[PDB]
Amino acid sequence: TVVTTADTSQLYALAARHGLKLHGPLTVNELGLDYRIVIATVDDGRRWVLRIPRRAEVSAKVEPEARVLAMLKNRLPFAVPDWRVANAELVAYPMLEDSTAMVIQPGSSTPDWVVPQDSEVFAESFATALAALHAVPISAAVDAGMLIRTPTQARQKVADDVDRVRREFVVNDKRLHRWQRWLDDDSSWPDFSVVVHGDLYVGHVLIDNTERVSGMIDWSEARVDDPAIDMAAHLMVFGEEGLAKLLLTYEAAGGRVWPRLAHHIAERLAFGAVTYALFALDSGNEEYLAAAKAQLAAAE
Ligand SMILES: CC[C@H]1OC(=O)[C@H](C)[C@@H](O[C@H]2C[C@@](C)(OC)[C@@H](O)[C@H](C)O2)[C@H](C)[C@@H](O[C@@H]2O[C@H](C)C[C@H](N(C)C)[C@H]2O)[C@](C)(O)C[C@@H](C)C(=O)[C@H](C)[C@@H](O)[C@]1(C)O
Ligand SMILES: Nc1nc2c(ncn2[C@@H]2O[C@H](COP(=O)(O)OP(=O)(O)O)[C@@H](O)[C@H]2O)c(=O)[nH]1
Concatenating the DSSP letter of every residue in 36-74 gives: EEEEEEETTS-EEEEEEE-SHHHHTTHHHHHHHHHHHGG
Residue 281 lies in a domain: yes
* Domain edge (last residue) among 70, 94, 118: 94
Question: Alpha-carbon distance 29 to 56, whole Å?
Answer: 20
Domain carrying residue 254: 102-297
Domain boundary, last residue among 46, 70, 94: 94
Residue 14 lies in a domain: yes
Q: Are both 117 and 222 inside the same structural domain? A: yes
Residues 88 and 128 in one domain: no
Q: Tell me, yes or no, whether 249 and 189 share the same domain.
A: yes
**Do 107 and 167 have their domain in common?**
yes
Phi-psi region of 216 (alpha: psi -120 to 50; beta: other; left: phi over 0): beta
The CATH number linked to 85 is: 3.30.200.20
Pairwise CA distance, residues 297 & 257, whole Å: 33
Atom of ligand 1 minimally distant from the CA of 229: 14
- Hey, which residues does 200 pair with through a beta bridge? none
Q: Identify whether residues 79 and 144 lie together within a single domain.
A: no
Are residues 128 and 51 part of one domain? no
Residues 69 and 146 both lie in one domain: no
- Judge residue 287's burial from the number of C-beta atoms within 10 Å of its C-beta, 0-12 exposed, 13-18 middle, 19 or more buried: exposed
d(CA 267, CA 188): 9
Question: Is 296 marked as a binding-site residue?
Answer: no
Q: CB count, 10 Å around CB of 41?
A: 16
64 CA to middle of ligand 2, Å? 18
* Residue 2 domain flag: no
Q: Is residue 3 part of a domain?
A: no
Same domain, 68 and 195: no
Residue 291 sits in a domain whose CATH number is: 3.90.1200.10
96 is in an annotated binding site: yes
From the CA of 199, give the closest atom in ligand 1.
16
Phi, psi of 114 (to 5 degrees): -135, 140
Residue 97 identity (one-letter amino acid): E
The dihedral built from the CA positions of residue 215, 219, 223 and 227, taken in this order, carries a sign that is negative
3-state secondary structure of 198: coil
Q: Which atom of ligand 1 is nearest to the CA of 279?
A: 29
Q: Is 279 in the pocket of ligand 1 (CB under 6 A)?
A: yes
Nearby residues of 248 by Cβ (< 8 Å), 6 or more positions away: none
Do both 135 and 55 map to the same domain? no
Ligand 1 centroid from CA 3, angstroms: 32
Whether residue 293 lies inside any domain: the answer is yes
Active site residues per annotation: 199
249 domain-assigned: yes
The response to whether residue 65 sits with its C-beta less than 6 Å from ligand 2 reads no
In terms of domains, do 78 and 177 share one? no
In a shared domain, residues 64 and 13: yes
Write the DSSP assignment of 107-149 as a string of letters: T-SS-SEE--TT-HHHHHHHHHHHHHHHTS-HHHHHHTT--B-
Separation CA 261–CA 124 (nearest Å): 18
Closest CA to 130 of 249, 298, 270: 249
CB 218 within 8 A of CB 199: yes
In this structure, the answer to whether residues 208 and 135 fall within a common structural domain is yes
Alpha helices in the chain (DSSP H): 8-16, 56-59, 62-72, 120-134, 138-143, 151-168, 173-183, 232-252, 261-270, 272-283, 286-297
Total count of residues recorded for the chain: 300
- For the Cβ of 77 lying below 6 angstroms from any atom of ligand 1, the answer is no
Domain count for the chain, please give it: 2
> For ligand 1, is residue 281 a contact (CB within 6 Å)?
no
Final residue belonging to a domain, choices 71, 94, 117: 94
> 35 alpha carbon to ligand 2 midpoint, in Å?
11
